């Protein structure tokens, strides 16, 4: 599964963590586009993103982002006018697509206020979803301009799928599974005395990985504890799975279409 998502941040008043408007785009997990209120220009985030794209594309979306930054300040003042909130708050936006490996189309557009679902868009009905009485007023304000809502629906359907398919071809270092994991079992202890089998796997890409423990020929149901798929820092990922030992235990790994088996030594 492949995805293209564009985020927008809107902080009311800045502190040591400047600026007010930040807009960063993503392709699955890697950043591609960079925009901030300090330097009002669209900057690349990936080495393959800087190439394959003309300077006219970077300049076109810069003026578009400069306009969206001005619109975000208006939406911030309007939110401060409707709500009783005054000071420093956050206004978020998220537009994206999820092109499935089979060919299924899924489009989405969302607006947020202080990390909470403010307004959710429904393309099939061409109307916004209000969270409360305060959200209902902005819902009616945006629902008026029919052609504006139709553009959002049209963009998510044909333009967004075409934009994501163009970026996937531009980035060969995304499609590659040329990074197999290093599954190694280690005996760990926190307090005396405790025993656990840590099936630690590192240096894998894509982040999509499956791990499980099997006692002889049966999976340990409602007992296996799982870690987090964490970024190593060198474009690779790490993950683990632990199980409480008692007086055959086998670790099963699924990555890059390869089923890895590890018996306890």
């Amino acid at each position, epitope marked *: 599964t492949h995805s293209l998502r564009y985020f927008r941040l809107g902080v009311s008043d800045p502190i040591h963590g400047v600026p007010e408007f930040i807009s960063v785009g993503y392709v699955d997990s890697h950043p591609i586009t960079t925009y901030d209120s300090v330097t009002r220009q669209k900057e690349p985030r990936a080495p393959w993103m800087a190439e394959n794209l003309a300077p006219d594309h970077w300049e076109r979306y810069t003026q578009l982002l400069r306009g969206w930054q001005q619109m975000f300040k208006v939406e911030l003042k309007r939110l401060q006018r409707h709500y009783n909130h005054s000071g420093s708050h956050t206004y978020q936006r998220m537009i994206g697509c*999820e092109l499935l490996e*089979d060919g299924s189309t*899924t489009g*989405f557009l969302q607006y947020a206020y202080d990390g909470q679902d403010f307004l959710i868009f429904n393309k*099939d009905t061409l109307s916004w979803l209000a969270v409360d009485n305060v959200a209902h007023t902005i819902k009616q304000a945006w629902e008026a301009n029919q052609h504006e809502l139709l553009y959002q629906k049209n963009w998510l359907e044909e333009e967004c799928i075409a934009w994501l398919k163009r970026f996937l071809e531009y980035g060969k270092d995304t499609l590659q599974r040329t990074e197999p994991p290093l599954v190694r079992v280690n005996r760990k202890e926190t307090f005396p005395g405790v025993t656990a089998l840590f099936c630690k796997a590192h240096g894998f890409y894509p982040p*999509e990985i*499956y791990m*499980t423990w099997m006692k002889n*020929g*049966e*999976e*340990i*149901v*409602q007992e*296996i*504890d*799982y870690g*987090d*798929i964490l970024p190593s820092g060198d474009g690779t990922y790490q*993950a683990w799975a632990s199980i409480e030992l008692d007086p055959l235990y086998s670790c*099963h790994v*699924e990555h890059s*279409g390869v*089923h890895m088996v590890l018996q306890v030594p």
Partner: T-cell receptor
Amino acid sequence: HLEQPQISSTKTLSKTARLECVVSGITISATSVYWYRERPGEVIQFLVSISYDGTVRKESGIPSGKFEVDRIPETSTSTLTIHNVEKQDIATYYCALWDRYYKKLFGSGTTLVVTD
Amino acid sequence: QKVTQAQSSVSMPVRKAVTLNCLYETSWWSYYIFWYKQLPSKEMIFLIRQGSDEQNAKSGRYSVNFKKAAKSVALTISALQLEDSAKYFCALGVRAFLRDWGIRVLIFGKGTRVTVEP
């Protein structure tokens, strides 16, 4: 598609009983068959699973030598054999298989009746 | 791995909307949530599927309000019908990327009985 020909199977106390499950479209030799039990007033729980290669798998709380699963390539059907049947086995049994390529199909269901 | 369904029996009239709150306790990073409709004639039917990293699924009349941090998978019906009178099931599955070898086991729930009154 999955279909269980037997609607109910009445078996005598502490005796062997076989439960039918016929596949449609895809062959048993290529896929894996899963088996579930739906206890009255309780949760649908997993029993045994036979892999495409031939290996058998179970669930925590099943003794060694109680359930048997077989898939004949000539007839193309999965059969579950329940040994030493007790009053705790009275439930609607379902057979499962993974659909193309996200959902999981389920059989018609076979309720088991145990008598003295 | 366990799925809890607090609602045992729900009575709702036709044309209205009904929300079935389902709670789950799991540990995997990537997983799936399956909703099933078991007819009184023992007929198990698939309705909708909800992925861990996926946006709120909608399959016609059926729509799931997915809460990741709260671990809630509430299914809402757009418009109620006569044929809706059946037992509803809440299932939990893994997200694997290989052949369906005997390990992809669904963790079901207690169940919710729906009796649609005229």
